[PDB]
């Protein structure tokens, strides 16, 4: 895992981290599968392009790659709006 710093930001009414990209995996899709772990292995190479895109134009909003395996890697890193089960609520978000 990674523990980001999460400074606040403008143009994002949230706290975002520009160092790396966040990954959203749907609740009913197990992380740690061979399929999933392989996507997280090669898709990491996108963070450099994410940062280069931002540094070329600092006004960019979310840049996201939606995988065919249900994964979603978006930049900049920001905590998901609805975490799994800390409250009574759950999230139903499949990028597909």
């Amino acid at each position: 895992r990674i523990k980001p710093v999460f400074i606040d930001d403008a143009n994002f009414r949230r706290q975002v981290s520009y160092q790396h990209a966040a990954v959203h995996i749907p609740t009913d899709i197990y992380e740690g599968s061979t399929i999933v772990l392989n996507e997280l292995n090669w898709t990491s190479a996108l963070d450099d392009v994410f940062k280069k895109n931002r540094e070329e134009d600092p006004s960019l909003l979310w840049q996201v790659f939606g995988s065919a395996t249900g994964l979603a890697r978006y930049y900049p890193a920001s905590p998901w709006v609805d975490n799994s089960r800390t409250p009574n609520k759950i999230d139903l978000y499949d990028v597909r």
């Binding site: 009913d28 065919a68 139903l92 499949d94 597909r96």
Partner: protein, 48 residues
């Protein structure tokens, strides 16, 4: 022609599989509610 076999039953499923992958389609099975979300969206893999 995309064909879906819904529920738990003892009826023959061969004819609908043939209908599926004769006309450049696909065949899906939806046995419960948990299968609906994932099976009703995967037809876009064929269309691409």
């Amino acid at each position: 022609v995309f064909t879906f076999s819904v529920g738990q039953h003892n009826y023959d499923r061969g004819p609908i599989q043939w209908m599926a992958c004769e006309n450049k389609g696909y065949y899906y099975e939806i046995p419960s509610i948990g299968a609906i979300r994932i099976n009703t969206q995967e037809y876009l893999d064929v269309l691409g």
